[PDB]
C-alpha cells in the first residue's frame, strides 16, 4: 500500500476519528449485549 | 495511429498492446483516465468470475449434489442466501480477496502482472510462448463468458427455463 | 532389466502424446517420462517415489485380498466370525465390527509410526540415503543385480497396474452391485 | 392527513429506541419535517421502488461530480480565459441551467 | 524474490528463512510494521496456549478431575462450573508466570532489551530436552507448526461448541448437522435492531 | 468537397464545421436511404410472421423498435467517439454518388412520410392508387 496514503492515515484527525469511533463502537457493542450496567455486578 | 479493432477510431494512447487481448478497443477512453493495470485486474477478475459462473450454470443443470435440493441457479442464489451457504461462499471469496487487495497493491507497485496469481499447479504453461497464447485465450474466454453469463441470467428472467433446457426446447 | 532408453530410462515416453518433461530425470526406477502436470519440478522426488512404491505394494496386496475373498477362499473359521458374503465392502464392515480391521490397522500404523516415518524423514533429510521404498526386506533374496533393474521395474509396473485394477474392481463392484469372480 | 412523515429509525442501544415513536401506518420512527414526502407525492413517485431508483440516480450523480472535480483539477483544468466568460456563463446559466431546468421540470 | 507461501507476492522483509516455519507468509506486511521478534514471541505464546487449550478440550472430554464441579464433558460449561476461586487462582498464577518468566521485561518497549533474549526462549527446558543441538531446528519447527495447528484447531472446537452445544469428540461421534433455523450470522442491522 | 454544386445560400458552412456538417449530411443520407428503401420494401414484401408511422407505434409495444434503438445506440456511441476524434484532428465518384443519392433519399423519405399523413398510404400504395 502507498506510503503517503498510510502517512495520511497516520495524521492526527484520521487517527483521532478512527480511534474514537472504535472506542465508541465497543462502548456501543458492550452496551448492546450487556445493557443497563449501573454497577459492577457483585 | 488508429485502432486494430475499430479502423476509423484512433488507437488509445495508453493501449500499446502490452496487455494480451488488446485490439485498441477503448472508445469511451477509460484508459486515458484510469490505470490500465487496475482495469486489467478488473477485467480478468470479472471474467474469471463469469467463466466459473457459466460452468456453474451448465454443471448445476446437469448435476446437483445429493445433499442440496434440485433447483434452478437463480433459485439457488436465493436458497443459499437463506440457508447459509451463500454467506460461506461470500466469506471465503472475501477472505481470498483480502490477499487480492495485497496482490493489487503489488501490481500498483509494479511488481506483479495484473492477472498473475502464479496459479499453475498443473504446469500447463510450459514456456513464455504458450503462456502468451494461453493468456490471449484466457482474456478472450473471459470477455466471452462475461457476455454469456449476462445472457444466461437475462434469458432465465424473461423465459423461466434453464440454458440447457432452453436449447432443448424452442 | 533397467534397459535405459527403451523403458525405465531417459528419452522414454510410454505415451508420446504427453511430452517428456525435463524435470523428470532418468534416475528414479520405472521412470517412463510420464508427467503431464509437471509435478516433478516442484515436488520432492524422493518422497513421491517412496509414496508411489508404498501405494503399489498396498494395491498389490489389495488385489490379492479382493481376489481371494471374491473367490470365497478363506482361512479356517474365518467365515464364521466375518461376513459370509464375498462382497469386499460387506466383509470390510464385518471385519471392522469383529476387530480384525482394527488389529491390522494398529500394527500397520505402528510400523508406519516407528519405521515408515523415520525412514521417510531420513531419506528426505539425507541421513541414510535410503533408496525410495527400501525396507531391507529380502527374506528369499531375489535382490542384488536383479533388484537394481528388472525387479524394481517389475514392482513399479505391476503395482501401477494393481492400483488401476483395485480402483476398477471396487467401482465395478459398486456400479454392478455384485462382486467380481 | 393521519400518518405522520417519518424517514429515520433509530437502533435500540441505550434506551434510545423510545425515539421510534408511533408516527402511524404500522410504523415506528423519528418524525421528519423536511417535506420530502410532500415533494415525492408532488413528483408522483407513489412507490418505494422509484425512491430506490432516485437514490441510485443521486448516487450516480454524486460519483460523477466527484469524478468531475478530480478531472477538472488534475486532468483538464480550464485556463483563466475560460472562467472570464461572464457573457457565455450567463447565457448558459439562464438558458441552459435555469431555462431547460424549468422546461424539463414543466415537462 | 517472491514468497514461497504466496507466490504472487513479494517476499516480505524481516522474513529471511532463519526462523522456524518461515515459509514467507506475511501478505498483510505486519512484519514490516511490527518487529519480527515480538511477532514470533506472540506467535509462540498463542500457539503454546492453544496446544494446551486443544489438549484441554479433548482431555476434559475423556478424563475429569473428581467431584461434581469438574464433571462437565462439554468444555465451555467447565468455564462456568469450575470453582471460581481456583479459576482466579489459575489467572493469578498465569500473571505471576508472565512476570517471572519474562523477567520483568514484559512490555513491547523492554522485552528483548537483553540482546541474549530470543523470541520464545523463556528458559523453559525442565528436563533439558533441547540439550541436543541437532534436534533444535526440527523441534523449533515442530513447535511452531504444532502451535499454528493448535490455534486453528482450538478456534474450530470453540466455535463448534458454540454452534453445537456438544463437546468436540462426542460432537464427532454424535454428529448432528446445522439446521440453519438458529445460529444465523449477523442480522443486528438488517431488521433495524431487535 | 464531394457534391459541391456551390449551393450554400444561407452560408451554414461559415458558422459550423464542414466536418460536422458533412458527417450530419452523410449520416442523414445513409439513414434516409435505408428508410426510403425500407418504405417501398414494407409494401412490396413482409418478412414472415410480420404503415409509415403507425407501424413504428405498433413495433414499440412489440419491442421490435426498442431492440433496434439499443443496438443502433451502441453503434452510435462508437460513432460519437469517431465524430469527436474527427473534429479534434472510382471512390471519388462513389462519394459524390452516395451524397447525391442520399440527398434524393432524404427528399424521397420526406415525401413518403407526408404522403402517408395525406392519404394514409405507403409509397408503393401511392403508385398503385
Ligand atoms: C447549458 C450549459 C450549462 C449548464 C447546464 C451549466 C450548469 C452548471 N454550471 Mg456552468 N458553465 C457553462 C455552461 C453550463 N453550466 C459554460 C459555458 C461555462 C463557461 C463560461 C460555465 C462555467 C461554470 C463555472 C465556472 C461554474 C459553473 C457551475 C455550474 C453548476 C452550478 C451549480 C448548480 O446549480 O448545479 C446544480 C444543478 C444541476 C442541474 C446539476 C446537474 C449537473 C450537470 C452538469 C447539468 C447538466 C447535465 C446535462 C446537460 C443534462 C442532460 C439532460 C438529459 C438527461 C436529457 C451547474 C452544474 C459552477 C459549479 O458549481 O461548478 C461545478 C461553477 O463554478 N459553470
Ligand atoms: C474447511 C473449512 C470450513 C469449515 C469448517 C466450514 C464449515 C461449514 N460450512 Mg463452509 N465452506 C468452506 C470452508 C469451510 N466451511 C469453503 C472453503 C467453501 C467453499 C467456498 C465453503 C462452502 C460452503 C457452502 C456452500 C456451504 C457450507 C456449509 C458449511 C456448514 C456445514 C454444516 C455441517 O457440518 O454439515 C455438513 C457436513 C459435511 C459436508 C461433511 C463433510 C459449516 C458451517 C453449508 C451450510 O449449511 O452452511 C450453513 C453450505 O451450504 N460451506
Ligand atoms: C493365518 C490364518 C489362519 C490359520 C492358519 C488358521 C488355522 C486354524 N484355525 Mg482359523 N481363523 C483365522 C485364521 C487362521 N486360522 C481367522 C482370521 C479367524 C477369525 C475370523 C479364525 C477363526 C477360527 C475359529 C473360530 C476356529 C479356527 C480353528 C483353526 C484351526 C483348525 C484347523 C483344523 O482342524 O482344520 C479344519 C479344517 C476344515 C474345517 C476343512 C474341512 C487351525 C490351526 C479352529 C480351532 O480353534 O481349532 C484349534 C476353530 O474352531 N479358526
Ligand atoms: C444548507 C442548504 C440548504 C439545505 C440543506 C436545504 C434543505 C431543503 N430545502 Mg432549501 N434552499 C436553500 C438552502 C438549503 N435548503 C437555498 C439557499 C435556497 C434558495 C435557492 C433554497 C430554496 C429551496 C426551495 C425553493 C425549496 C427548498 C426545499 C428544501 C427541502 C428539500 C431538499 C430538496 O430536495 O430540495 C428540492 C428543491 C425543490 C424540490 C424545489 C427547488 C425549486 C428551486 C427554485 C430550484 C432552484 C434551482 C436553482 C439552481 C437555484 C439557483 C439560484 C438562483 C438565485 C440563480 C429541504 C428542507 C424544498 C422544500 O422546502 O420542500 C418542502 C423547496 O421547495 N429549498
Ligand atoms: C497458595 C497456595 C494455594 C492454596 C492454599 C490453595 C487452596 C485451594 N485451592 Mg488453589 N491454586 C493455587 C494455589 C493455592 N490454592 C495455584 C497456584 C493454582 C494454579 C495452578 C491453583 C488452582 C486451583 C484450582 C483450579 C482449584 C483450586 C482449589 C483450591 C481449594 C481446594 C483445595 C483442595 O481440595 O485441595 C485438595 C485437592 C488436591 C490437592 C488436588 C490436586 C489436584 C491435582 C494435583 C491437580 C493437577 C495439577 C496440574 C497438573 C496443574 C499443573 C500446572 C501447575 C504446575 C502450574 C483450596 C481453597 C479448587 C477449588 O476452589 O475447589 C473448591 C479448584 O478448583 N486451586
Ligand atoms: C429478417 C426478419 C425475419 C425473418 C427471416 C422471419 C422469418 C420467420 N418468422 Mg418472423 N417476424 C419478423 C421478422 C422476420 N421473420 C418480424 C419483424 C416480426 C414482428 C415482430 C415477426 C413475427 C413473427 C411471428 C409472430 C412468427 C414469425 C414466424 C416466422 C417463420 C415463418 C416461416 C414462414 O412462413 O416462411 C415461409 C414458409 C413457407 C412458405 C412454407 C413453410 C420464419 C422463420 C412464425 C414462426 O415460425 O415462429 C415460431 C411466427 O409465428 N415471425
Ligand atoms: C510403546 C508403545 C506401543 C504402543 C502400541 C499401540 C500404538 C501403536 C500405534 C497405533 C496408532 C493408531 C492405530 C490404531 C489403534 C487402534 C486400533 C483399533 O482397533 O481402532 C479402533 C477403531 C475401530 O474400533 C473397533 O470397533 C468395533 C466395534 O464397533 C470392534 O468391535 C472393536 O471394538 C474395534 O476394532 O478403529 C477405527 O475406527 C479406524 C477408522 C479408520 C482408520 C483408518 C483405516 C485404515 C486406512 C484406510 C482408510 C481410508 C479411508 C478413505 C476415506 C473414507 C471416507 C469414509
Ligand atoms: C486472522 C483471524 C481471521 C478471522 C476470520 C473471521 C471469521 C469470521 C468472520 C465472519 C464470518 C462470516 C460473516 C457472515 C456474517 C455476516 O456478514 O452478517 C451480516 C452482518 C450485518 O447484518 P445484515 O445487514 O446482513 O442483516 C441481514 C439480514 O438478512 C438479517 O437481518 O454483517 C456484520 O456486520 C457482522 C460482523 C460484525 C462486523 C464488525 C466485527 C467486529 C469488528 C472488529 C474489528 C474488525 C475485524 C474484522 C471485521 C470484518
Ligand atoms: C449467483 C449464482 C452463480 C454465480 C455467479 C457469479 C459470481 C457471476 C459473475 C458474473 C460476472 C462477474 C459477470 C461480469 C460481467 C461483465 C460484463 C458483461 C462487461 C460488459 C462490458 C462490455 C460489453 C464493454 C465494454 C467497453 C470496452 C471494453 C471499451 C470502452 O471504452 C467502451 C465499452 C463500454 C463498450 C451461478 C451463476 C454459478 C449459479 C448459482 O446457482 C447462483
Ligand atoms: C503463562 C503463558 C502460557 C499459559 C497458559 C494457561 C492458559 C495455563 C492454564 C493452566 C491451568 C488450567 C492450570 C490448572 C491447574 C489446576 C489445578 C491445580 C486443580 C486443582 C484441583 C484441586 C486443588 C481440587 C479438588 C477437589 C475439591 C475441592 C472437591 C471435590 O468434589 C472435587 C476435587 C476432588 C477435585 C504458556 C504456558 C502456554 C506460554 C507462556 O509461558 C505464557
Ligand atoms: C518443552 C518442554 C517439555 C514439555 C511440554 C508440553 C506441555 C508439551 C505438550 C505439547 C502439546 C500439548 C502439543 C499439542 C498439540 C495439539 C494440536 C496440534 C491439536 C491440533 C488440533 C487440530 C488441528 C484439530 C481439530 C478438530 C476439529 C476442529 C473438529 C473437532 O470436532 C475435532 C478435531 C479435534 C479433529 C517438558 C515439560 C516435557 C520438559 C522439557 O525439558 C521442555
Helix (H) or strand (E) holding D29: strand D28-31
What are the phi and psi torsion angles at B75 (to 5°)? -60, -30
What are the phi and psi torsion angles at D31 (to 5°)? -70, 130
What count of other Cβ atoms lies within 10 Å of the Cβ of residue E146?
A: 15
Residue with cell 421510534: D20
Interchain pair E8, B112: CB under 8 A = yes
Q: Quick check: D5 and D33 in contact, CB under 8 A?
A: yes
Residue among C135, C176, C180, C149 at smallest CA distance from C1: C149
The three grid cell numbers given for residue C148, joined into one nine-digit string: 537394481
Q: Ligand 3 pocket, C139 CB below 6 A?
A: no
Residue with cell 467380481: C180
The rounded distance, in Å, linking the Cα atoms of E167 and E54 is: 12
Which numbered ligand comes closest to the C-alpha of E65? 10
Q: How wide is the angle at C-alpha E40 spanned by C-alphas E38 and E46, nearest 5°?
A: 100
Q: Quick check: C29 and C156 in contact, CB under 8 A?
A: yes
Q: How far is the CA of E90 from the centre of ligand 10 (A)?
A: 6
- Secondary structure class of E136 (helix, strand, coil): helix
Interchain pair E9, B116: CB under 8 A = no
Print the SS3 string covering C40-57. HHHCCHHHHHHHHHHHHH
- Secondary structure class of D28 (helix, strand, coil): strand
Buried b vs exposed e over C118-142: b needs ≥16 C-beta within 10 Å?
Answer: ebbeebeeeeeebbbbbeeeeeeee
The rounded distance, in Å, linking the Cα atoms of D18 and C61 is: 76
Helix (H) or strand (E) holding D30: strand D28-31
Q: How far is the CA of B97 from the centre of ligand 8 (A)?
A: 15
What distances in angstroms separate CA B29 from CA B4, B21, B37, B40, one per listed residue? 16, 17, 15, 14
What are the phi and psi torsion angles at A10 (to 5°)? -85, 0
Burial of residue B145, with CB atoms counted within 10 A of its CB: 0-12 exposed, 13-18 middle, 19 or more buried: buried
CA atoms within 13 A on the CB side of F117: 5
The rounded distance, in Å, linking the Cα atoms of D11 and A35 is: 14
The set of residues, in sequence order, having a beta carbon less than 8 Å from that of B53 and lying 6+ positions away, is B145, B149
What count of other Cβ atoms lies within 10 Å of the Cβ of residue C181?
A: 10
Q: How wide is the angle at C-alpha C88 spanned by C-alphas C87 and C92, nearest 5°?
A: 120
What count of other Cβ atoms lies within 10 Å of the Cβ of residue E112?
A: 16
The rounded distance, in Å, linking the Cα atoms of C100 and C85 is: 16
Ligand 4 pocket test, candidate residues D5, D32, D39, most atoms within 8 A of CB: D39
Helix %, strand %, coil % for chain F, to 5?
Answer: 75, 0, 25
**Method by which the model was determined:** cryo-EM
Residue E70 CA: nearest ligand 5 atom is: 64
Residue among B51, E23, E28 at smallest CA distance from A1: E28
Residue among E23, E20, E30, E28 at smallest CA distance from E7: E23
- Secondary structure class of F118 (helix, strand, coil): helix
The rounded distance, in Å, linking the Cα atoms of C57 and C134 is: 12
Helix %, strand %, coil % for chain A, to 5?
Answer: 70, 0, 30
Q: How far is the CA of F41 from the centre of ligand 6 (A)?
A: 16
Spell out the alpha helix ranges (H) of chain C.
39-42, 45-70, 78-81, 88-98, 100-111, 117-125, 145-146, 152-176
Order of strands across the sheet that contains D21-22: D6-8, D28-31, D21-22
Q: Quick check: C167 and C63 in contact, CB under 8 A?
A: no
Q: Quick check: D21 and D28 in contact, CB under 8 A?
A: yes
Q: Quick check: E168 and E157 in contact, CB under 8 A?
A: yes
The set of residues, in sequence order, having a beta carbon less than 8 Å from that of F101 and lying 6+ positions away, is F29, F33
What is the 8-class DSSP label of residue C72?
Answer: T
Q: Quick check: C71 and C181 in contact, CB under 8 A?
A: yes
- Secondary structure class of D6 (helix, strand, coil): strand
- Secondary structure class of E116 (helix, strand, coil): coil
CA dihedral E96, E101, E103, E106 (to 10 degrees): -70
The set of residues, in sequence order, having a beta carbon less than 8 Å from that of E166 and lying 6+ positions away, is E74, E160, E174, E176
The three grid cell numbers given for residue B150, joined into one nine-digit string: 449476462
The three grid cell numbers given for residue E185, joined into one nine-digit string: 450470522
> D28: which strand partners?
D22
Residue C98 CA: nearest ligand 3 atom is: 20
Q: If you measure CA to CA, which chain D residue comes closest to E188?
A: D11
Q: How wide is the angle at C-alpha E112 spanned by C-alphas E107 and E117, nearest 5°?
A: 135
The rounded distance, in Å, linking the Cα atoms of D21 and C116 is: 73
What residues of E are in the B interface, CB distance below 8 Å?
2, 6-10, 27-29, 178, 180, 184-185
What count of other Cβ atoms lies within 10 Å of the Cβ of residue C25?
A: 12
The rounded distance, in Å, linking the Cα atoms of E188 and E121 is: 44
Q: Ligand 3 pocket, C77 CB below 6 A?
A: yes
- Secondary structure class of B94 (helix, strand, coil): helix
Q: Quick check: D13 and A31 in contact, CB under 8 A?
A: yes
The rounded distance, in Å, linking the Cα atoms of D18 and D21 is: 6
Q: Is F24 on the interface with B (CB under 8 A)?
A: no
Residue among F115, F117, F111 at smallest CA distance from F129: F115
The rounded distance, in Å, linking the Cα atoms of C128 and C148 is: 18
The three grid cell numbers given for residue A7, joined into one nine-digit string: 502517512
Chain A nearest-CA distance from D17, in A, is: 12
Residue among E28, E27, E25, E51 at smallest CA distance from E120: E51
> C64: which strand partners?
none
Residue among B34, B49, B42, B21 at smallest CA distance from B103: B42
What distances in angstroms separate CA D4 from CA D25, D31, D39, D47, D100, one per listed residue? 8, 7, 15, 17, 35
> C99: which strand partners?
none
The three grid cell numbers given for residue C101, joined into one nine-digit string: 480391521
Contacts of F70 in chain B (CB under 8 A): none
Helix (H) or strand (E) holding D21: strand D21-22
Helix (H) or strand (E) holding D31: strand D28-31
What are the phi and psi torsion angles at D30 (to 5°)? -80, 125
The three grid cell numbers given for residue B157, joined into one nine-digit string: 428472467
The rounded distance, in Å, linking the Cα atoms of B141 and B48 is: 9
What are the phi and psi torsion angles at C121 (to 5°)? -65, -40
The rounded distance, in Å, linking the Cα atoms of C70 and E105 is: 70
The three grid cell numbers given for residue B49, joined into one nine-digit string: 468470475
What are the phi and psi torsion angles at D7 (to 5°)? -130, 20
What distances in angstroms separate CA B77 from CA B74, B104, B152, one per listed residue? 5, 28, 14
Residue B81 CA: nearest ligand 8 atom is: 29
> E2: which strand partners?
E10
Q: What is the DSSP string of B103-142?
A: HHHHHHTTSS-TT-----TT----SHHHHHHHHHHHHHHH
Q: At what angle do helices C88-98 and C45-70 cross, to 10 degrees?
A: 100
The rounded distance, in Å, linking the Cα atoms of E45 and E122 is: 10
Q: Ligand 7 pocket, C110 CB below 6 A?
A: yes
Amino acid at each position: 500500500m502507498d506510503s503517503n496514503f498510510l502517512k495520511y492515515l497516520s495524521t492526527a484527525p484520521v487517527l483521532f476519528t478512527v480511534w474514537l469511533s472504535f472506542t465508541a463502537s465497543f462502548i456501543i457493542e458492550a452496551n448492546r449485549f450487556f445493557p443497563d450496567m449501573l454497577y459492577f455486578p457483585m | 495511429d488508429f485502432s486494430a479493432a475499430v479502423p476509423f477510431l484512433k488507437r488509445p494512447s495508453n493501449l500499446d498492446g502490452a496487455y494480451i487481448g488488446d485490439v485498441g478497443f477503448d472508445p469511451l477512453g477509460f484508459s486515458d483516465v484510469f490505470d490500465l493495470r487496475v482495469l486489467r485486474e478488473a477485467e480478468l477478475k470479472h471474467g474469471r468470475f463469469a467463466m466459473l459462473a457459466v460452468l456453474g450454470f451448465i454443471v448445476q443443470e446437469l448435476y446437483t449434489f445429493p445433499f442440496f435440493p434440485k433447483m434452478a441457479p437463480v433459485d439457488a442464489h436465493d436458497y443459499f442466501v437463506k440457508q447459509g451457504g451463500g454467506s460461506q461462499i461470500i466469506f471465503w471469496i472475501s477472505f481470498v480477496e483480502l490477499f487480492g487487495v495485497v496482490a493489487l497493491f503489488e501490481t500498483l507497485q509494479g511488481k506483479r502482472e495484473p492477472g498473475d496469481f502464479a496459479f499453475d499447479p498443473l504446469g500447463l504453461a510450459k514456456d513464455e510462448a504458450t503462456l502468451e497464447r494461453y493468456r490471449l485465450a484466457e482474456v478472450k474466454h473471459a470477455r466471452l463468458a462475461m457476455i454469456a453469463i449476462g445472457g444466461f441470467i437475462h434469458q432465465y428472467w424473461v423465459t423461466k427455463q434453464t440454458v440447457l433446457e432452453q436449447l432443448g426446447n424452442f | 532389466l533397467w534397459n535405459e532408453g527403451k523403458i525405465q530410462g531417459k528419452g522414454v515416453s510410454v505415451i508420446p502424446l504427453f511430452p517428456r518433461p525435463a524435470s523428470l530425470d532418468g534416475t528414479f526406477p520405472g521412470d517412463q517420462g510420464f508427467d503431464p502436470f509437471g509435478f516433478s519440478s516442484w515436488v520432492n522426488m524422493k518422497f513421491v517415489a517412496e509414496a508411489e512404491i508404498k501405494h503399489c505394494r498396498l494395491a498389490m496386496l489389495a488385489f490379492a485380498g479382493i481376489m481371494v475373498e471374491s473367490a470365497g477362499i478363506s482361512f479356517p473359521g474365518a467365515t464364521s466370525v466375518l461376513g459370509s458374503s464375498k462382497n469386499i465392502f460387506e466383509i470390510h464392515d464385518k471385519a471392522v465390527a469383529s476387530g480384525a480391521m482394527g488389529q491390522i490397522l494398529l500394527w500397520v500404523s505402528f510400523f508406519e509410526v516407528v519405521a515408515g516415518v523415520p525412514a521417510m524423514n531420513e531419506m528426505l533429510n539425507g541421513e541414510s540415503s535410503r533408496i525410495p521404498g527400501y525396507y531391507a526386506f529380502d527374506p528369499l533374496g531375489q535382490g542384488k543385480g536383479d533388484k537394481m533393474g528388472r525387479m524394481q521395474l517389475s514392482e513399479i509396473q505391476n503395482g501401477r497396474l494393481a492400483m488401476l485394477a483395485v480402483s476398477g474392481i471396487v467401482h465395478h463392484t459398486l456400479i454392478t452391485g455384485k462382486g467380481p469372480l | 392527513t393521519a400518518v405522520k412523515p417519518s424517514a429515520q429509525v433509530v437502533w435500540p442501544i441505550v434506551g434510545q429506541e423510545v425515539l421510534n415513536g408511533d408516527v402511524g401506518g404500522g410504523f415506528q420512527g423519528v418524525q421528519v419535517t423536511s417535506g420530502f414526502f410532500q415533494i415525492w407525492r408532488s413528483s408522483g413517485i407513489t412507490s418505494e421502488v422509484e425512491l430506490y431508483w432516485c437514490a441510485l440516480a443521486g448516487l450516480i450523480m454524486s460519483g460523477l461530480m466527484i469524478f468531475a472535480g478530480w478531472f477538472h483539477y488534475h486532468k483538464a483544468a480550464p485556463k483563466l480565459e475560460w472562467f472570464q466568460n461572464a457573457e457565455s456563463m450567463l447565457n448558459h446559466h439562464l438558458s441552459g441551467l435555469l431555462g431547460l431546468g424549468c422546461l424539463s421540470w414543466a415537462g | 524474490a517472491k514468497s514461497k507461501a504466496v507466490p504472487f507476492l513479494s517476499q516480505p522483509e524481516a522474513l529471511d528463512g532463519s526462523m522456524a516455519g518461515d515459509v514467507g507468509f506475511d501478505p498483510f506486511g505486519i512484519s514490516s510494521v511490527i518487529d519480527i521478534k515480538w511477532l514470533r514471541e506472540s506467535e509462540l505464546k498463542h500457539g503454546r496456549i492453544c496446544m494446551l487449550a486443544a489438549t484441554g478440550c479433548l482431555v476434559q472430554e475423556v478424563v475429569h478431575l473428581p467431584g461434581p464441579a469438574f464433571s462437565q464433558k462439554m468444555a465451555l460449561n467447565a468455564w462456568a462450573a469450575a470453582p471460581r476461586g481456583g479459576m482466579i487462582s489459575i489467572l493469578v498464577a498465569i500473571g505471576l508466570i508472565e512476570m517471572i518468566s519474562n523477567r520483568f521485561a514484559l512490555t513491547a518497549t523492554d522485552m528483548f532489551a537483553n540482546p541474549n533474549r530470543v523470541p520464545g526462549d523463556l528458559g523453559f527446558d525442565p528436563l533439558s530436552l533441547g540439550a541436543n543441538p541437532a534436534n533444535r531446528a526440527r523441534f523449533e519447527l515442530s513447535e511452531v507448526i504444532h502451535g499454528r495447528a493448535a490455534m486453528m484447531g482450538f478456534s474450530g472446537m470453540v466455535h463448534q461448541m458454540i454452534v453445537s452445544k456438544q463437546a468436540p469428540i462426542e460432537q464427532l461421534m454424535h454428529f448432528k448437522a446445522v439446521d440453519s433455523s438458529l445460529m444465523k450470522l449477523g442480522g443486528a442491522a438488517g431488521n433495524l435492531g431487535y | 468537397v464531394p457534391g459541391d454544386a456551390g449551393f450554400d445560400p444561407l452560408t451554414i458552412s461559415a458558422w459550423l464545421d464542414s466536418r460536422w456538417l458533412r458527417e450530419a449530411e452523410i449520416k442523414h443520407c445513409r439513414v434516409a436511404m435505408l428508410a426510403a428503401a425500407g418504405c417501398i420494401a414494407q409494401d412490396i414484401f413482409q418478412f414472415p410472421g410480420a404503415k409509415m408511422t403507425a407501424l413504428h407505434d405498433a413495433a414499440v409495444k412489440a419491442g421490435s423498435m426498442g431492440q433496434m434503438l439499443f443496438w443502433i445506440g451502441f453503434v452510435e456511441a462508437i460513432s460519437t467517439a469517431a465524430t469527436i476524434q474527427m473534429l479534434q484532428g472510382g471512390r471519388a465518384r462513389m462519394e459524390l454518388s452516395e451524397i447525391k443519392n442520399g440527398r434524393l433519399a432524404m427528399i424521397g423519405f420526406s415525401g413518403m412520410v407526408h404522403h402517408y399523413f395525406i392519404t394514409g398510404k405507403g409509397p408503393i400504395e401511392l403508385l398503385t392508387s
